[PDB]
Amino acid sequence: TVTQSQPEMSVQEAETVTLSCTYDTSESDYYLFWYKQPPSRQMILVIRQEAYKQQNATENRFSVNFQKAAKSFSLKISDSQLGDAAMYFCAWGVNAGGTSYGKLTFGQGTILTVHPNIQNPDPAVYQLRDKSVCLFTDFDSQTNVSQSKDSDVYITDKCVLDMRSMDFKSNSAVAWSNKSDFACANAFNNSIIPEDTFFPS
Amino acid sequence: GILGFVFTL
Amino acid sequence: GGITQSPKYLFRKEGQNVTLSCEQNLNHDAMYWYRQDPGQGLRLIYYSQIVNDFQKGDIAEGYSVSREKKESFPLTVTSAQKNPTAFYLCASSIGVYGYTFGSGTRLTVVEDLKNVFPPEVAVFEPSEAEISHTQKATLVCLATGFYPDHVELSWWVNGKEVHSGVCTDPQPLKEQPALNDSRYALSSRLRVSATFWQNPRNHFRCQVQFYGLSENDEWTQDRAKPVTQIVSAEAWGRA
């Protein structure tokens, strides 16, 4: 068995975060893995470790703390980047003497959310014409957007875009509906938003 | 017990 | 060299057999098939250490594989597999080294075929309030009322795909959640400098690739067949 006790975890950009992993086995020698699966769904190997060998590496930001007696294989992400947003899987495998070489047994995984650092928040709610949609944008990562009753109004969770050319990052959520009374002033009522949010008249 | 790791020439 | 998995998206009618293809030119002996489910990690289905060698995983029942060649390891999801809705990943290795996974495949069980619908795509031009306040222009694209959740949304500016300044919802939204079968909606945003949008020669297009019915399937309904197609919506810069 491989156990990842934290289904989800959050980190602020540029800070560090530790993902935990503990395993149970009777084998003297074996292999331990950390895999990264970003939104693309592509599995990417982060680190492999053999019990026989000693902790080693790394040139990169990523690192692991392997406690053989404790059976702990934690992954450490330092100077977190937005690209680190992904699902991280801890995995275990027998050595060459085992019958199921090289079958991998995976933990339940940990979803890592990276909260961007926005330097100059300018929260506002804009109306976009083609049906109509309301755009809540430029709010800081501390702001949270909530699904809203009634059922006939649709709201998406916040989402971070990066205008690489301008070294600018912004948060944004979208709300829309086809009913009559729907308006931007009341579109995000169910969410706590900065009182000074800009609403153009 | 024999090897569980198989590989080809 | 690499490993290529196929198809990317795929659906199965109940009582139907389906096969996923996996090919690798890495000269690897072993090939594996994994199944991914929310709330669970990856669980091995089958693996073949060498041609004409087959080892079942704990969840092998309902599945079958063949390894007539070194390069290929197709997986078949038989109708006997009771709950096959999941994400399938091919893998290849020599022992524990060179472990590589394929692109992945998403399989859905469509009990009733009438539920399939392609997405209606719409672009929404940026508000002049945002442009004057932030000197930036955000476009919003809405893909609505599509089933199943097999979509790929991209932005194309002046004929070239763009990824900078783009944000798409990590997962779509069910328009009517109460229903077990619900049509989906997805939103994406494209932000550019004010000056760029002000130019009317700039052309913006939101492309959505939908994966739906095929020629193998039979369409009895009056409405156009929900086939695999690309639904697009465009907008033009305005001074």
Place this chain on the structure above:
Amino acid sequence: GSHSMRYFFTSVSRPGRGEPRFIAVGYVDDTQFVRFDSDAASQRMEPRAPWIEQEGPEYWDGETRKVKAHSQTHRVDLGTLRGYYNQSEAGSHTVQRMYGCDVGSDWRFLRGYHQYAYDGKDYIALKEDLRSWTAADMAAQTTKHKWEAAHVAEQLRAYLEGTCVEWLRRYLENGKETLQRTDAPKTHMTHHAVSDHEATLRCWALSFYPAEITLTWQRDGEDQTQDTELVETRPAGDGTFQKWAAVVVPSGQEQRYTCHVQHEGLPKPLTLRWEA
């Protein structure tokens, strides 16, 4: 003392007759304890010593599942070597493979082995350091490069240095009665007469275990490299071994020659002289 576990694999192609023959045999020291025979009816790994029969079903299913994968691998290798050497599909060719580990008196890892042969010739062998390979010819360098890229040696080390020793310790303990015994050789002597002047003397060593032994013929004095007949140590069939050494000598000097028997079971070397 020292101990070892070795597995010997033989694959022989049989074009126009059927699948290639495959035989696996496992040894602890000079004692066989398991076999797999492609031409047998069981198609499973079979016990060949009483002390391995105590293993449970999961042991035999695993060894069966592993050894059939060995069988499949050598089946592929036969065709690959046929290509490497551009040999026709008509002739029969042999692939032999041996791996295992040695341990010292403390039962700790001492050496590891993993080597192949094609048609009776060295093909590729793992070096003592367990990190590099010896390619016998240009064709085997293709395998050497393949196995370097796949880090085969690194992955094999855990088995040869670790798992192999763990298995060997277990077997030595479960078969202590037979594996850890020592039978001293029972020695006697015979006199054969070549015509007239010259005669032969034969030194016999019987019912000894392990098979390690040395027989030397002393004249006057000291050993005789010339005119010494030494047959290969042979198995008696009951777990012990036999061997004899013979020397050709003129008649009348039988008392001058003496036989020296050195065996692990003997407290000190034995010296035999005519007659008895």
Place this chain on the structure above:
Amino acid sequence: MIQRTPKIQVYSRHPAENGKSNFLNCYVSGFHPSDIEVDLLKNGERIEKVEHSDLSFSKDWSFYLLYYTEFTPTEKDEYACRVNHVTLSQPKIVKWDRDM
């Protein structure tokens, strides 16, 4: 292939005693390739109840086998081992010599 002609040794498990049960052994070793035919003969005729060891090989890769059968030696019974191999122009007979 590189052929190796077998070495053949015919001998009894225990010291031969007339009227006392024993085992007659034929040990073929040092040969290549693996295909080989070995039979034990009593007074020139083939012995059916013959068992043999599992094919193995030595450091130099040459194979070796042990064929054996249970017999009770007598004063005038002749025993031999008949081996056939690609290296042999004809099947080779090696008689059992009690007095060695």
